[PDB]
C-alpha cells in the first residue's frame, strides 16, 4: 500500500520474502526469526545475489536490553588456500577454486540459538514450498540472468534450472528450484549440522573439488560463526549507529559520516542549486578521503587494524580530513593519502 | 549481495547483508543439492592480479588460510538516545554498498527525505581509485554541473548504483522501503 506499518515491518528485495518475514513476525517470531525466514526466501527469488552457498553479517539490536550485537558469518579462505593461489581474475572469479567456505547456515544457527522464538524448521517451511512450486522470475533476477546469459546458457548445470528451452528465463517466467527445496528440507529437519558435519557435507566437498576447488570436510567441520558483543558504533547527534567493524566497511561508513557531520547538513543544504552542488561536491570529497584509508583494512584476526580503525572512527581525525576538503575543487589521488602499508 | 531490514513489534531490529559475491557466485551449482557456491575468494587482493590501471594490490587483504576477505557490506542500525530504533539500513552493490548506505542515511537524517525518497533518490559514487565519479541517469543535472565545474570527471552509470532496503521510525509507526532498482517491496502490519 503505502508501506508505513503501526507494529512491525520487513524490507527485503523481493515482495514475497518481505511477506514471509512479516508472517513469521505475525506468528510470534523474533526479529531474527523473520530475518532468517526472509533470507532463506531471498536465496531463492534472488538466487544470483545470496544464499546458503555464501556468507552474511547480521547487526542485531535488542530494545529491551538496549544492546546491539553483530554476528559474523562471512566465508573464510579454506585451510589449503595461500596468497599466490590465483594468477588471473578469471581464476579468482569462476570455478571451485574461487569458492570460500560458506558461513551462511552457521550464521543463521548462531542468530537463532541466541534470539529465535519460532522452531528452526518453521523458518524454512515457506521457502521449501516456494522452491517446489516455482515462482515468476522478478525484475532483479531477470536482469541478472540477462547480464550473465552466455555463461548460464553454456553451463548445463546452471541452465538446468535457470533456462527454459536452453535460453535464460525472463521476467514473469516460472523459476523452479527442486534440488534446493530438498536441501532446505534436510536443513530444516537435521539442523545446521547437516551442512557442516552431517548428511550434506561430503557432497558439498565433492561438488567444490569437482569444479577444481580445494575446500575439504575439515574446512566445513571447522567453520564457526562469531558473536561480536561490541560492534562498531558512532555517535551522530542524539543517535548511535551500530555497524560491523573490519572485515566489513563500518570504519569506512563511520569516516564518511564523521567527516560530513561537521558541515551540519540540513534541508537547506539542498534548497538551492548553489547549496546543493556544494553539498554533493563535499559528499564526493568525503567518499575519496574515506576510501583512501580503506586499503589498510583486512580481517582483524590476521592483520592489525586497531589504530587504522581508531583513526577512521575518530571525529578529530575526521575534522582533519574535512579541513582539507576544498570547496571549489577536487584533487589528485595522492592528495587523499591512500595507503597500502601502515 | 542482498540487504534486508527488519523491525519487530517489540522494537527489536535486524539489519542483515548476505552475499555469494558476483552474480551466481562462482557459477558452480551442485547438481545434487542445488547449492550455488559463492566466489568470495575474489574479494581478496592478490599480489599477481591487477584489477585497475595503476591500482596496486592491498597486502592487508591478501589470502591467508582461515582469513575472511575485506567486504564493502555495512548493515547498520541507528538507535535514538531513548533506546528506540530510528533507522535500519544497508545495501547491496560491491564497493557501492558503503557510499549508497551513507547516502540513504544523509538523505533521511539530514536532507529530511522520507524513507521511500531516501531509497529512490538518485545516487553517485566515487571510490578514489578509479578516479572517476559515477552518477545515476536521473541525477539533478545541477549536481553534475557543480561537480564538473569543480573538476570532477563524471560518468553515468549504465544501470544503477547499489540497492538499498531501509526502515525508519516515524510518528505513524515504521516506514519501510525497498529499492525499485531491484523490484522489492516491503510488508508489515
Ligand atoms: C598461479 O601461480 C602460482 C605461482 O607459480 C602457483 O603456485 C599457482 O598454482 C597458480 N594458480 C593458478 C590458479 O593458476
Ligand atoms: C532481548 O533481551 C531480553 C532480556 O535479556 C530478552 O528477554 C528478549 O527476548 C530479547 N529480545 C530479542 C528480540 O532478542
Ligand atoms: C563430523 O564431526 C566430527 C567431529 O568434528 C568429525 O570428526 C566427523 O568426521 C564429521 N563428519 C562429517 C560427515 O563431516
Ligand atoms: C561504542 O563503542 C565504543 C568502543 O567500544 C564504546 O565505548 C561504547 O560502549 C559504544 N557506544 C555505544 C553507544 O554503545
Ligand atoms: C592516525 O592519524 C594520525 C594523525 O591524526 C597519524 O599520525 C597516524 O599516522 C594515523 N595512524 C594510522 C595507523 O594511520
Ligand atoms: C584525478 O581527478 C582529479 C580531478 O580532475 C585530477 O586533478 C587528477 O589529475 C586525476 N588523476 C589523478 C592521478 O589523481
Ligand atoms: Cl535447485
Ligand atoms: Cl538487495
Ligand atoms: Na515504500
- What's chain A's length in residues? 342
Are A21 and A37 in contact by the 8 Å Cβ rule? The answer is: yes
Ligand 4 and A230: CB distance under 6 A? yes
Ligand nearest to the CA of B14: 2
Number of domains in chain A: 2
Beta bridge partners of B78: A241, B87
Grid coordinates given for A238:
542524539
Domain boundary among A230, A256, A280: A230
Instruction: Please indicate whether, in this complex, the C-beta atoms of B189 and A8 are within 8 angstroms of each other.
Output: yes
Helix (H) or strand (E) holding A184: helix A178-190
Instruction: Please indicate whether, in this complex, the C-beta atoms of B102 and A200 are within 8 angstroms of each other.
Output: no
- What's chain B's length in residues? 189
The b/e string for A257-268 (b: 16+ C-beta within 10 A; e otherwise) is: bbbbbebebeee
Q: Residue A28: left if φ>0, alpha if ψ -120 to 50, beta else—which one? A: left
A179 — phi, psi (to 5°)?
-65, -50
Q: Which residues contact A272 (CB under 8 A, 6 or more apart)?
A: none
Longest CA–CA separation in chain A, Å: 63
Q: CB-side exposure of B94: number of CA atoms within 13 Å?
A: 12
From residue A162, give the alpha-carbon distance in Å to each of A95, A149, A250, B21, B183.
Answer: 18, 10, 35, 18, 19
Q: Closest Cα to residue B175, out of B166, B184, B183?
A: B166
Q: Which chain B residues touch A246 with a CB distance below 8 Å?
A: 70
State the nearest Cα–Cα gap between A119 and chain B, in angstroms.
17
- Resolution attained, angstroms: 2.1
Ligand nearest to the CA of B165: 8
Q: Closest Cα to residue A139, out of A107, A163, A173?
A: A173
Give residue A36's domain range: 1-230
Helix (H) or strand (E) holding A57: strand A55-62
Q: Residue B128: left if φ>0, alpha if ψ -120 to 50, beta else—which one? A: left
Grid coordinates given for B12:
527489536
- CA B97, CA B114: separation in Å to the nearest integer? 20
From residue B104, give the alpha-carbon distance in Å to each of A9, B3, B24, B120, B123.
Answer: 18, 13, 27, 9, 9
Q: Obtained via which technique?
A: X-ray
Q: Do A206 and A276 fall into the same domain?
A: no
- CA A330, CA A280: separation in Å to the nearest integer? 12
Long-range contacts of residues A141-150, Cβ cutoff 8 Å, at least 24 apart:
A141/A45, A141/A46, A141/A47, A141/A48, A141/A175, A142/A169, A142/A170, A142/A171, A142/A172, A143/B159, A144/A46, A144/A48, A144/A49, A144/B23, A144/B24, A145/A48, A145/A169, A145/A170, A146/A170, A147/B23, A148/A48, A148/B23, A148/B24
Q: How far is the CA of A86 from the centre of ligand 1 (A)?
A: 6
Are A228 and A243 in contact by the 8 Å Cβ rule? The answer is: no
Q: Do A89 and A23 fall into the same domain?
A: yes
Residue B142: how many other CB atoms lie within 10 Å: 14
Give residue B56's domain range: 1-189
Which residue of A10, A11, A92, A329 is the best one to mutate when testing the B interface, meaning the one whose CB has the most B CBs within 10 A? A11
From residue A305, give the alpha-carbon distance in Å to each of A92, A127, A251, B63, B66.
Answer: 25, 40, 10, 16, 17
Q: Provide the 8-state DSSP code for B74.
A: -
CATH number of the structural domain spanning residue B122: 3.60.20.40
Q: Which chain A residues touch B105 with a CB distance below 8 Å?
A: 241, 257
Domain boundary among A215, A230, A245: A230
* B1 has catalytic annotation: yes
CATH number of the structural domain spanning residue A295: 1.10.246.130
Q: Do A131 and A267 fall into the same domain?
A: no
> Helices A178-190 & A31-45, crossing angle to 10 degrees?
160
Are A100 and B21 in contact by the 8 Å Cβ rule? The answer is: no
Q: Binding residue per annotation — A114?
A: no
Domain boundary among A185, A213, A230: A230
Which residue of B10, B17, B21, B29 is the best one to mutate when testing the A interface, meaning the one whose CB has the most A CBs within 10 A? B29
Grid coordinates given for A160:
538446468
Q: Do A173 and A248 fall into the same domain?
A: no
- CA A52, CA B168: separation in Å to the nearest integer? 29
Return the residue of B nearest to A333 by Cα.
B128
Q: Do A189 and A283 fall into the same domain?
A: no
Breaks (C–N over 2.5 Å) after residues, chain A: none
Q: Do A247 and A181 fall into the same domain?
A: no
- Do β-strands B76-80 and A239-243 pair in parallel, antiparallel, or remain unpaired? antiparallel
Q: Closest Cα to residue B37, out of A72, A214, A288, A285?
A: A214
Q: Closest Cα to residue A50, out of A108, A90, A95?
A: A108
Question: What is the full DSSP assignment across A114-162?
Answer: HH--S-HHHHHHHHHHHHHH-EE--HHHHHHHHHTHHHHHH-HHHHHHH
State the nearest Cα–Cα gap between B90 and chain A, in angstroms.
10
Q: What does the angle CA A31 – CA A52 – CA A75 come to, to the nearest 5 degrees?
A: 95
Are A336 and B128 in contact by the 8 Å Cβ rule? The answer is: yes
Atom of ligand 3 nearest to the CA of A193: 1
| Burial tier of A314 (Cβ tally within 10 Å: 0-12, 13-18, 19+) | middle
Number of domains in chain B: 1
Longest CA–CA separation in chain B, Å: 57
Q: Whose CA is nearest to atom 12 of ligand 6?
A: A332
State the nearest Cα–Cα gap between A293 and chain B, in angstroms.
10
- CA B2, CA B64: separation in Å to the nearest integer? 26
Q: Do A193 and A321 fall into the same domain?
A: no
Omega before B130 within 30 of 0, i.e. cis = yes
Q: Closest Cα to residue A9, out of B165, B109, B184, B167?
A: B167
State the nearest Cα–Cα gap between B160 and chain A, in angstroms.
12
Instruction: Please indicate whether, in this complex, the C-beta atoms of A59 and B16 are within 8 angstroms of each other.
Output: yes
Q: Do A193 and A322 fall into the same domain?
A: no
| Burial tier of A229 (Cβ tally within 10 Å: 0-12, 13-18, 19+) | exposed
Which residue of A6, A9, A115, A144 is the best one to mutate when testing the B interface, meaning the one whose CB has the most B CBs within 10 A? A9
Helices (H), chain B: 96-105, 115-120, 141-148
Q: Whose CA is nearest to atom 6 of ligand 6?
A: A332
Q: Closest Cα to residue A162, out of A15, A47, A50?
A: A47
Instruction: Please indicate whether, in this complex, the C-beta atoms of A32 and B14 are within 8 angstroms of each other.
Output: yes
Instruction: Please indicate whether, in this complex, the C-beta atoms of B165 and A11 are within 8 angstroms of each other.
Output: yes
Q: Do A223 and A248 fall into the same domain?
A: no
Atom of ligand 3 nearest to the CA of A202: 13
- CA A91, CA B138: separation in Å to the nearest integer? 37
Beta bridge partners of A164: A167
From residue A249, give the alpha-carbon distance in Å to each of A70, A83, A110, A114, B68.
Answer: 13, 22, 22, 24, 13
Ligand 2 and A62: CB distance under 6 A? yes
Q: Do A162 and A175 fall into the same domain?
A: yes
Q: Do A235 and A220 fall into the same domain?
A: no
Q: Do A50 and A156 fall into the same domain?
A: yes
- CA A43, CA A60: separation in Å to the nearest integer? 20
Q: Which chain B residues touch A12 with a CB distance below 8 Å?
A: 2, 4, 165, 178, 184, 186
Grid coordinates given for A152:
548460464
- CA A291, CA A298: separation in Å to the nearest integer? 14
Q: How far is the CA of A120 from the centre of ligand 2 (A)?
A: 18
Ligand nearest to the CA of B152: 6
- CA A91, CA A88: separation in Å to the nearest integer? 5
Amino acid at each position: 500500500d503505502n508501506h508505513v506499518y503501526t507494529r512491525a515491518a520487513v524490507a527485503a528485495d523481493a515482495k514475497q520474502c518481505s511477506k514471509i518475514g512479516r508472517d513469521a513476525l505475525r506468528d510470534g517470531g523474533s526479529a531474527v526469526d523473520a530475518a532468517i525466514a526472509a533470507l532463506l526466501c531471498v536465496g531463492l527469488m534472488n538466487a544470483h545475489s545470496m544464499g546458503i552457498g555464501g556468507g552474511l553479517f547480521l547487526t542485531i539490536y535488542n530494545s529491551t536490553t538496549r544492546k546491539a550485537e553483530v554476528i559474523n558469518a562471512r566465508e573464510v579462505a579454506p585451510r589449503l588456500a595461500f596468497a599466490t593461489m590465483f594468477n588471473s581474475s578469471e581464476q579468482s572469479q569462476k570455478g571451485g577454486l574461487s569458492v570460500a567456505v560458506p558461513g551462511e547456515i552457521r550464521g543463521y544457527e548462531l542468530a537463532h540459538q541466541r534470539h529465535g522464538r519460532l522452531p528452526w524448521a518453521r523458518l524454512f517451511q515457506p521457502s521449501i514450498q516456494l522452491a517446489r512450486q516455482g515462482f515468476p522470475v522478478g525484475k532483479g533476477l531477470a536482469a541478472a540472468l540477462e547480464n550473465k546469459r552466455t555463461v548460464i546458457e553454456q553451463q548445463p548445470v546452471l541452465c538446468e534450472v535457470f533456462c527454459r528451452d536452453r535460453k535464460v528465463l525472463r521476467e514473469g517466467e516460472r523459476l523452479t528450484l527442486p534440488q534446493l527445496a530438498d536441501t532446505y528440507e534436510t536443513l530444516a529437519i537435521e539442523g545446521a549440522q547437516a551442512f557442516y558435519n552431517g548428511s550434506l557435507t561430503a557432497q558439498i566437498v565433492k561438488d567444490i573439488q569437482a569444479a577444481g576447488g580445494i575446500v575439504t570436510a575439515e574446512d566445513l567441520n571447522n567453520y564457526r560463526a562469531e558473536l561480536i558483543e561490541h560492534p562498531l558504533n558512532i555517535s551522530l547527534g542524539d543517535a548511535v549507529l551500530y555497524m560491523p567493524s573490519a572485515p566489513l566497511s563500518g570504519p569506512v561508513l563511520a569516516l564518511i559520516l564523521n567527516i560530513l557531520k561537521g558541515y551540519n547538513f540540513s534541508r537547506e543544504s539542498v534548497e538551492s542549486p548553489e547549496q546543493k552542488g556544494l553539498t554533493y561536491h563535499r559528499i564526493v570529497e568525503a567518499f575519496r578521503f574515506a576510501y583512501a584509508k580503506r586499503t589498510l583494512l583486512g580481517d582483524p584476526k590476521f592483520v592489525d587494524v586497531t589504530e587504522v580503525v581508531r583513526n577512521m572512527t575518530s571525529e578529530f581525525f575526521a575534522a582533519q580530513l574535512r579541513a582539507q576538503i576544498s570547496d571549489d575543487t577536487t584533487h589528485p589521488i595522492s592528495y587523499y593519502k591512500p595507503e597500502f602499508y601502515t | 549481495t542482498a540487504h534486508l531490514s527488519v523491525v519487530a513489534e517489540d522494537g527489536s531490529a535486524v539489519s542483515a547483508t548476505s552475499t555469494i559475491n558476483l552474480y551466481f557466485g562462482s557459477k558452480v551449482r551442485s547438481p545434487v543439492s542445488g547449492i550455488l557456491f559463492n566466489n568470495e575468494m575474489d574479494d581478496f587482493s592478490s599480489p599477481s592480479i591487477t584489477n585497475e590501471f595503476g591500482v596496486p594490490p592491498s597486502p592487508a587483504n591478501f589470502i591467508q588460510p582461515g582469513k575472511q576477505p575485506l567486504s564493502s557490506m555495512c548493515p547498520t542500525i541507528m538507535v535514538g538516545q531513548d533506546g528506540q530504533v530510528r533507522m535500519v539500513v544497508g545495501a547491496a552493490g560491491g564497493t557501492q554498498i558503503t557510499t549508497a548506505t551513507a547516502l540513504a542515511i544523509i538523505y533521511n537524517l539530514w536532507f529530511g527525505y522520507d524513507v521511500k525518497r531516501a531509497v529512490e533518490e538518485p545516487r553517485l559514487h566515487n571510490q578514489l581509485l578509479p578516479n572517476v565519479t559515477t552518477v545515476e541517469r536521473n541525477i539533478d543535472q545541477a549536481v553534475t554541473a557543480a561537480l564538473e565545474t569543480r573538476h570532477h570527471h563524471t560518468q553515468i552509470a549504465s544501470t544503477f548504483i547499489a540497492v538499498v532496503q531501509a526502515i525508519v521510525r516515524t510518528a505513524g509507526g515504521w516506514a519501510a522501503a525497498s529499492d525499485s532498482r531491484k523490484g522489492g517491496e516491503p510488508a508489515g502490519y
